[PDB]
């Protein structure tokens, strides 16, 4: 997990709520006593919109992208066109808290201290409907049919689109645990509704709920988060915290959660409420964390007036062996794919998955606080029945991880450790420079060769049953990537200047080189043939002859028979070789 | 013998201190003895002059702690008299010889709160909170309460968490500071 600050700004005042245009082109911020309009690309502030008298406690923006609602301490609500003019003013009973447009009908809600004011577009009246309590936060059901309200009294209650109240839940403790934000999960058929478009006055004055599929994220100042159905039933258990949370929030996908608060950061979670990481940490309280439409960007607002725009990068985690691509799905599962039979198996963890490695009959997975060893139960090469062999409850720091027949191999930042299954260390090796790359190159069970590449450009072979590391070669630049041919006679190396170099190992001599490479593999059966990717091309080379070039983006992970296992930005693609051409 | 507060022990202590002071009229540890024994004996007017006597002298590194103690005890007696200006002078003179003194700041923060300077009181209470290693929950309360009155409700709630962290079940703070700061937070 990685997050990058794309741009930053600081307002004159505190920032209370955030709205995005549905195409993601503009960001609107309820800062102090004005609305601020921002470009999401680079944070240029286009205009301070002037209409309100007092504190703009929130803003929200309708799914058609024509109109947005903003609410004030001066009791007003204003409906702004996307032409940035405030065509229909309104004036509520007291100060506004949260406002929220309906996903389907564009019907608005506007919450206040006792009273919540529903209306549907350009009708002549508003349902100023009454509440037991201060109405802190509001969210429409994903199909648009219920508005759910959270109360300072520690109750969540569910109201239909007409304003009748249908369901209640109390957090045990009541007003001890104020509900400061709630959110319905976006994950249903309606998310593509309004995803197909290419197009100042005053306004005066439900059964079988267990079969309704929606799920509600609740963040309460008892310092707990929990998920709930429209039936009022709690899902699982309260995911405890050590802070006052705010603005529990989701990406467009409905699968990852953002969680801001008095932890002064934006924490990231699964839809099961398991922690996955940390978006940028902050000088002051976080009030707001809004994911950008259609994309992995995030925007944050804090008590000190800082706005921060982050890109989340979600790196790739995988390993291949000969023909078994194992890779990270969600951020908690490994999908292991038999590339000949096209079978898949899912193994579910209960944490983040940080590292994966695979070898004949052995799979290994590293989580934040344990490492898992998995075993195929049969010697059948078509088997997929992985069982957990052993589970090492120990925390590790690593740069790289690999697995062998009886051992886990850990690369710490200049040091290689061999650990038994069951965690007892066997042997260790100390390099003359920082390790940049490692691969297992096969062997008999328990004497396996490892192939190692260093930042100084030295290349080593290390046998897991031996205390001394064997120099194969040294190079003028760092090893970026590294592979051995089917017989173990030949080496391919990527030199960290984006070139591939190819060597004889038995004589320690360069055969040939190529001026554009990023990843490389030998054909696993047909020696004297290899493949690499670089600069937007796939490149197949046979036996010192010219190289076949065709357009591709993605990277070569392996090469078997007539197929090259290229990896696209999320999934394996299995390109086929023109055998007729090298022939 | 003073610290027992048993009257015969405190009178014996006063007598040894006055005997030493009669042999050595500038002996600060004995003069602080006289003042402290007289305070325990409720002879506060006799303590007052025997501290003024010390307060006129130049400081030195050997008597430094008894100087710093004597100025603080005299500053307390000046707060009983309500002539806070001489207490503030003694507290600041104490800090000029030793900037670490938590009791010099804690008395000064109380004067700033009496003067309705809730911000400067919060500055003194922040030093006293910090240099208590957050083990003074009474300053914890005062710091949160002064942030509440300064219209700094988030900062008040920060400290109400830090007090409950420092001491679970600590009385008063949850209802009065924490829930009134929460109740203001969106008005």
UniProtKB/Swiss-Prot annotation, chain A:
Expression sites (tissue/organ): Expressed in many tissues. Predominant expression in testis and pituitary.
Tell me the Gene Ontology biological-process terms attached to this UniProt entry. Answer: camera-type eye morphogenesis; cilium assembly; embryonic body morphogenesis; embryonic forelimb morphogenesis; embryonic heart tube development; embryonic heart tube left/right pattern formation; establishment of protein localization to organelle; intracellular signal transduction
Q: Where are the WD repeats?
A: 10-50, 51-91, 93-129, 131-169, 240-279, 281-321, 474-513
Its annotated compartments are: Cell projection, Cilium; Cytoplasm, Cytoskeleton, Cilium basal body
Q: Which domain of life is it from?
A: Eukaryota
Which keywords does the record carry?
Cell projection, Ciliopathy, Cilium, Cilium biogenesis/degradation, Cytoplasm, Cytoskeleton, Developmental protein, Disease variant, Ectodermal dysplasia, Repeat, WD repeat
Coarsely, its chief localization is other
Effect of substituting residue 284 to F: In CED1; no effect on interaction with ITF43:WDR35
Q: What is the effect of changing residue 7 to C?
A: In CED1; perturbed ciliary protein trafficking; no effect on interaction with ITF43:WDR35; fail to assemble IFT-A complex at the cilia base; no effect on ciliogenesis
Q: What's the impact of mutating residue 353 to L? A: In CED1; uncertain significance
* Result, substituting residue 534 to V: In CED1; decreased ciliogenesis; perturbed ciliary protein trafficking; strongly decreases interaction with ITF43:WDR35; fail to assemble IFT-A complex at the cilia base
Write out the domain note: Forms the trimeric core subcomplex IFT122:IFT140:WDR19 via the C-terminal region, whereas it interacts with IFT43:WDR35 via the N-terminal region containing the WD repeats.
Per UniProt, subunit arrangement is: Component of the IFT complex A (IFT-A) complex. IFT-A complex is divided into a core subcomplex composed of IFT122:IFT140:WDR19 which is associated with TULP3 and a peripheral subcomplex composed of IFT43:WDR35:TTC21B. Interacts with IFT43:WDR35; the interaction connects the 2 IFT-A subcomplexes. Interacts with IFTAP; the interaction associates IFTAP with IFT-A complex.
Q: Associated disorder, per UniProt?
A: Cranioectodermal dysplasia 1: A disorder characterized by craniofacial, skeletal and ectodermal abnormalities. Clinical features include dolichocephaly (with or without sagittal suture synostosis), scaphocephaly, short stature, limb shortening, short ribs, narrow chest, brachydactyly, renal failure and hepatic fibrosis, small and abnormally shaped teeth, sparse hair, skin laxity and abnormal nails.
Give the function comment from the record.
As a component of the IFT complex A (IFT-A), a complex required for retrograde ciliary transport and entry into cilia of G protein-coupled receptors (GPCRs), it is required in ciliogenesis and ciliary protein trafficking. Involved in cilia formation during neuronal patterning. Acts as a negative regulator of Shh signaling. Required to recruit TULP3 to primary cilia.
Stated name of the protein: Intraflagellar transport protein 122 homolog
What organism is recorded for this protein?
A: Homo sapiens (Human)
Shown residues in whole-protein numbering: 1 to 621 of 1241
Swiss-Prot record, chain B:
Impact reported for residue 38 to C: In NPHP12; hypomorphic variant in vitro
Q: What is the effect of changing residue 57 to V?
A: In JBTS11; hypomorphic variant in vitro
Listed name of the protein: Tetratricopeptide repeat protein 21B
The record's similarity note reads:
Belongs to the TTC21 family.
Organism per entry: Homo sapiens (Human)
Compartments where located: Cytoplasm, Cytoskeleton, Cilium axoneme
Q: Which residues of the full protein are shown?
A: 1130 to 1316 of 1316
Q: Which disease is it linked to?
A: Ciliary dysfunction leads to a broad spectrum of disorders, collectively termed ciliopathies. Overlapping clinical features include retinal degeneration, renal cystic disease, skeletal abnormalities, fibrosis of various organ, and a complex range of anatomical and functional defects of the central and peripheral nervous system. The ciliopathy range of diseases includes Meckel-Gruber syndrome, Bardet-Biedl syndrome, Joubert syndrome, nephronophtisis, Senior-Loken syndrome, and Jeune asphyxiating thoracic dystrophy among others. TTC21B is causally associated with diverse ciliopathies. Nephronophthisis 12: An autosomal recessive disorder resulting in end-stage renal disease. It is a progressive tubulo-interstitial kidney disorder histologically characterized by modifications of the tubules with thickening of the basement membrane, interstitial fibrosis and, in the advanced stages, medullary cysts. Some patients manifest extra-renal features including retinal, skeletal and central nervous system defects.
Oligomer status and interactors: Component of the IFT complex A (IFT-A) complex. IFT-A complex is divided into a core subcomplex composed of IFT122:IFT140:WDR19 which is associated with TULP3 and a peripheral subcomplex composed of IFT43:WDR35:TTC21B. Interacts directy with WDR35 and TTC21B. Interacts with TTC25.
Task: Show the taxonomic lineage.
Answer: Eukaryota, Metazoa, Chordata, Craniata, Vertebrata
| Positions annotated as TPR repeat | 68-101, 103-135, 137-170
Relate the protein's function as given in its record: Component of the IFT complex A (IFT-A), a complex required for retrograde ciliary transport and entry into cilia of G protein-coupled receptors (GPCRs). Essential for retrograde trafficking of IFT-1, IFT-B and GPCRs. Negatively modulates the SHH signal transduction.
């Amino acid at each position: 997990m990685r997050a990058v600050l794309t741009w930053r700004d600081k307002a004159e005042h505190c920032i209370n709520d955030i709205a995005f245009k549905p195409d993601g082109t503009q960001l609107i911020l309820a800062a102090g006593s004005r609305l601020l309009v921002y470009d999401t690309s680079d944070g240029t502030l286009l205009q301070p919109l002037k209409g309100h008298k007092d504190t703009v406690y929130c803003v929200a923006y309708a799914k058609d992208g024509k109109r947005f609602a903003s609410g004030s301490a001066d009791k007003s609500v204003i409906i702004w066109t996307s032409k940035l003019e405030g065509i229909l003013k309104y004036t509520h009973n007291d100060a506004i808290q949260c406002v929220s447009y309906n996903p389907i009908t564009h019907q608005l809600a506007s919450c206040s201290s006792s009273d919540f004011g529903l209306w549907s577009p350009e009708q002549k009246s508003v349902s100023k409907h009454k509440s037991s309590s201060k109405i802190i936060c509001c969210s429409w059901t994903n199909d648009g049919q219920y508005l759910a309200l959270g109360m300072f009294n520690g109750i969540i209650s569910i109201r239909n689109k007409n304003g009748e109240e249908k369901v209640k839940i109390e957090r045990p403790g009541g007003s001890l645990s104020p509900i400061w934000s709630i959110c319905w999960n976006p994950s249903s058929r309606w998310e593509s509704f309004w995803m197909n478009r290419e197009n100042x006055x005053x306004x005066x004055x439900d059964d079988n709920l267990e079969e309704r599929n929606d799920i509600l994220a609740v963040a309460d100042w008892g310092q707990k988060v929990s998920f709930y159905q429209l039936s009022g039933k709690q899902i699982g258990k309260d995911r405890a915290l050590n802070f006052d949370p705010c603005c529990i929030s989701y990406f467009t996908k409905g699968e990852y959660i953002l969680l801001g608060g008095s932890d002064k950061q934006v924490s990231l979670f699964t839809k099961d409420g398991v922690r996955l990481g940390t978006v940028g940490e902050q000088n002051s309280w976080v009030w707001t964390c809004q994911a950008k439409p259609d994309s992995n960007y995030v925007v944050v607002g804090c008590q000190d007036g800082t706005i921060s725009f982050y890109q989340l990068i979600f790196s790739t985690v995988h390993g291949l062996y000969k023909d078994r691509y194992a890779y990270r799905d969600s951020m908690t599962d490994v999908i292991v794919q038999h590339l000949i039979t096209e079978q898949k198996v899912r193994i579910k963890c209960k944490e983040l998955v940080k590292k994966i490695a695979i070898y004949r009959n052995r799979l290994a997975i590293q989580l934040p606080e344990k490492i898992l060893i998995y075993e195929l139960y049969s010697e059948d090469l078509s088997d997929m029945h992985y069982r957990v062999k052993e589970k090492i409850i120990k925390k590790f720091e690593c740069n790289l991880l690999v697995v062998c027949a009886n051992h886990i191999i850990l690369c710490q930042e200049k040091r290689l450790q061999c650990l038994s299954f069951s965690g007892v260390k066997e042997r260790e090796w100390q390099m003359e420079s920082l390790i940049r790359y490692i691969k297992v190159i096969g062997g008999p069970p328990g004497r396996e060769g490892l192939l190692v590449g260093l930042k100084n450009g030295q290349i080593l072979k290390i046998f897991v049953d031996n205390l001394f590391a064997i120099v194969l070669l040294k190079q003028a630049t760092a090893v970026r990537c590294l592979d051995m041919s089917a017989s173990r006679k030949k080496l391919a190396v990527v030199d960290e200047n984006d070139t591939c170099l190819v060597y004889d190992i038995d004589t320690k001599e360069l055969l040939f080189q190529e001026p554009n490479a990023n990843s490389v593999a030998w054909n696993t059966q047909c020696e004297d043939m290899l493949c690499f990717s670089g600069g937007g091309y796939l490149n197949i080379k046979a036996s010192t002859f010219p190289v076949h070039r065709q357009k591709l983006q993605g990277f070569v992970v392996g090469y078997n028979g007539s197929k090259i296992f290229c990896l696209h930005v999320f999934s394996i693609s299995a390109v086929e070789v023109p055998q007729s051409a090298p022939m | 013998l003073m610290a027992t507060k048993q009257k015969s022990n405190v009178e014996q202590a006063l007598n040894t201190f006055t005997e030493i002071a009669a042999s050595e009229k500038e002996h600060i540890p004995a003069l602080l003895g006289m003042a402290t024994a007289y305070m325990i004996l409720k002879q506060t007017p006799r303590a007052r002059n025997q501290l003024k006597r010390i307060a006129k002298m130049n400081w030195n590194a050997i008597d430094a702690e008894e100087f710093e103690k004597s100025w603080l005890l005299l500053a307390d007696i000046y707060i009983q008299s309500a002539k806070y200006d001489m207490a503030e002078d003694l507290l600041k003179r104490c800090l000029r010889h030793n900037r670490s003194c938590c009791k010099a700041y804690e008395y000064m923060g109380y004067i700033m709160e009496k003067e309705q300077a809730y911000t400067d009181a919060a500055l003194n209470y922040e030093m006293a909170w910090k240099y208590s290693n957050r083990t003074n929950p009474a300053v914890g309360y005062k710091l949160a309460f002064n942030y509440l009155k300064a219209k700094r409700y988030v900062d008040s709630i920060d400290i109400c968490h830090q007090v409950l962290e420092a001491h679970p079940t600590y009385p008063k703070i949850r209802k009065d500071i924490l829930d009134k700061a929460r109740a203001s937070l969106r008005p």
